[PDB]
Design a protein around this ligand. Structure first.
Ligand SMILES: NC(=O)c1ccc[n+]([C@@H]2C[C@H](COP(=O)(O)OP(=O)(O)OC[C@H]3O[C@@H](n4cnc5c(N)ncnc54)[C@H](O)[C@@H]3O)[C@@H](O)[C@H]2O)c1
Length: 196
């Protein structure tokens, strides 16, 4: 498995002020003050609960979820340009002492496997996760959506990089970061190769 093991959370730039003000991402069930959601299940490892009790990450950028945004398949119609990739690592979460679990596919699938030890990152399909071509077979899309789940909240200061589609969005991100001079200022990188 890649070490450190990057984890990616995609979110609309309109959510960044709320993340910086709270100093964290909040799990769905912890009522984040979201401005845009990009939406179109029990967790059997401790600390248990359901998927929406965790802040979720993928193990790749340019995810199938981002393709659904790009293709207008979400209720959200603003497309990929305003969507940030927030980058951290699985090892940082462990080092910070935060409870996590991770899956080998979307956890709602009956055959989904759940893990809580970093050595079990070997159980994931890294061919699917890292694939640039994932149209067929259908299982590639499923296994590409392996997720890293952090219970209840994810501190902003674990984010190492904000990746953006364009110069204009990179500049907007820096304007927002400068409104919270106490908040960690990660590097901001234009990564067109992480988008469609
Ligand atoms: N976003 C991802 O990278 C990702 C990864 C894995 C799975 N998923 C699932 C795909 C599906 C839709 O995703 P999404 O729109 O992220 O989930 P969601 O519909 O649960 O909406 C939560 C939203 O709140 C945002 N948010 C969190 N904390 C704050 C805060 N402090 N202030 C402002 N906004 C905040 C978060 O970034 C996200 O946009 C959900 O079922 C997710 O669990 C998403």
């Amino acid at each position: 498995y890649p070490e450190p093991t990057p984890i990616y959370h995609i979110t609309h730039i309109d959510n960044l002020k709320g993340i910086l003000r709270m100093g964290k991402l909040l799990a769905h069930n912890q009522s984040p003050p979201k401005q845009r959601s990009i939406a179109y299940a029990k967790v059997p490892q401790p600390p248990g609960g359901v998927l929406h009790d965790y802040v979720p990450f993928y193990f790749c950028p340019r995810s199938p979820m981002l393709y659904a945004i790009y293709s207008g398949a979400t209720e959200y119609q603003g497309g990929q340009e305003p969507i940030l990739h927030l980058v951290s690592s699985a090892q940082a979460v462990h080092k910070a002492g935060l409870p996590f679990v991770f899956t080998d596919r979307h956890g709602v699938l009956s055959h989904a496997r759940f893990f809580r030890q970093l050595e079990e990152l070997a159980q994931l399909d890294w061919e699917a996760i890292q694939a640039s071509y994932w149209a067929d077979p259908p299982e590639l899309r499923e296994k590409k959506q392996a997720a890293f789940l952090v219970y209840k909240a994810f501190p902003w200061a674990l984010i190492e990089e904000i990746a953006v589609y364009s110069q204009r969005v990179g500049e907007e991100v820096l304007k927002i970061l400068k409104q919270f001079p106490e908040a960690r200022r990660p590097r901001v990188c234009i990564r067109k190769d992480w988008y469609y």
